[PDB]
Amino acid sequence: FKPLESYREDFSFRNSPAAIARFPFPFPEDQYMYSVNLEPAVSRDPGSVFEHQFDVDEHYVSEMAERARVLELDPGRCLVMPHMAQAAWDTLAMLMEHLARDYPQHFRLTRQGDAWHWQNLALGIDQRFTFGDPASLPCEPLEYITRQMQGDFAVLDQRDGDLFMDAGMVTCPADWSLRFDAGMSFKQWHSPVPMAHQMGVFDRALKYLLNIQVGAPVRRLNWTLTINPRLDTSPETYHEWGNDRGKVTPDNVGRLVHLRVELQLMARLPRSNALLFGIRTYLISLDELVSNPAWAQRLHRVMRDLPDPIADYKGITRYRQTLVDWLRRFDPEA
Ligand code: HEM
Ligand code: NA
């Protein structure tokens, strides 16, 4: 864990060379188009973000501090409807189990029956509590555990052939809100997305997700851009970030524009049968990214050619020509 970094104000966040090397670059081709890009979430590539189900990285302590700030200002970024309480406990079990197994230097879990002892050595937490008993923890169980894991989470109720957004912790969203989307179904909350509905992407995706079983979780990547390493790009806070989209110049693209990638996990929760949706968010400035000349050239092509409805949905319109002009420098054929 490096020294404490900010994702707001002075934006001190930066990636080490190792974090650059493992950044989940999301473009298999020189152009991007939506698809059902799901794969089984099996361990691969030691040291990569795909090695464990939940990835903890050099930014862990910084990110937890950011989460704590968001929640101090707005506790309503976490919601669990009452029928989702068991699912919240399943989520806590899943995270503590995997984190203790995969990062034993940082986390420990010892259990006898419902008498659980969790230690997070990274954050200095030593908690004896009763699994299932919310009066035994300092806050509601989803909140408790997600205050200790990177990325956002949604917990979906599976009923009546569909998935409903009935719980979550959403403090680093790509410009959407849990309080807006609470209780919506799968196709409903995706209503703003261009193109993909007419393509069938959302019909096919719902079908795959409804069939996910215990022990066979699934993953995909999503991406966007963000100006500065701002994690909290929420509707709730738009006045704090939306104007920065007007601040990009030819000389500062490398410092301001960041590639944002979501490594998404979809995993069946064993007691409740709910689906856990992990949204693990990675950020990299374009100065850091263009250290890899293959990334740089591919990014130029993608951004130059991106369909306009998709660029507008993603929020890149305002600075796109500047960005494309800057990236052309790393594409010899261009
Ligand atoms: C339960 C699982 C999922 C949840 C909770 C979720 C949630 C969301 C949310 C809230 C948005 C933002 C919509 C907005 O602008 O207000 C979004 C966008 C998106 N979702 Fe999902 N989603 C899930 C699964 C999937 C899967 C499996 C796909 C497969 C393709 C998918 C494809 C997309 C696409 C293409 C967008 C637009 C993103 C962009 O252009 O950057 N989603 N999703
Ligand atoms: Na293809």
Swiss-Prot record:
It comes from the Bacteria. Changing R220A: Loss of catalytic activity. Still able to bind O2. The keyword Heme applies. This is Heme-dependent oxidative N-demethylase alpha subunit. The heme-dependent oxidative N-demethylase (HODM) is a heterotetramer composed of a catalytic alpha subunit, a FMN/2Fe-2S-dependent oxidoreductase beta subunit, a gamma subunit with putative aminotransferase activity, and a delta subunit of unknown function. Changing E262Q: Loss of catalytic activity. Still able to bind O2 but not DMA. Keywords: Heme, Iron, Metal-binding, NADP, Oxidoreductase. It comes from Ectopseudomonas mendocina (strain ymp) (Pseudomonas mendocina). InterPro entries: HODM_asu-like. Traditionally, PAS domains are known for signal transduction, sensing various stimuli. Ortmayer et al. reveal that PAS domains can also support enzymatic activity. The alpha subunit of HODM contains a heme-binding PAS-scaffold that serves as the site of the oxidative N-demethylase activity. Its EC number is 1.14.13.238. The active site is at R220. Component of the heme-dependent oxidative N-demethylase (HODM) enzyme, that catalyzes the NADPH-dependent oxidation of dimethylamine (DMA) to methylamine (MA) and formaldehyde. Functions in bacterial methylated amine catabolism, linking alkylamine oxidation to the tetrahydrofolate C1 pool. The alpha subunit of HODM binds heme, oxygen and DMA, and serves as the site of the oxidative N-demethylase activity. GO terms for molecular function: metal ion binding; oxidoreductase activity. It catalyses: dimethylamine + NADPH + O2 + H(+) = methylamine + formaldehyde + NADP(+) + H2O. It is an enzyme of class 1 (oxidoreductase). Heme b binds at Y34, H190, N222, Y313, K314. Transmembrane segments: none annotated. Dimethylamine binds at E262. The keyword NADP applies.
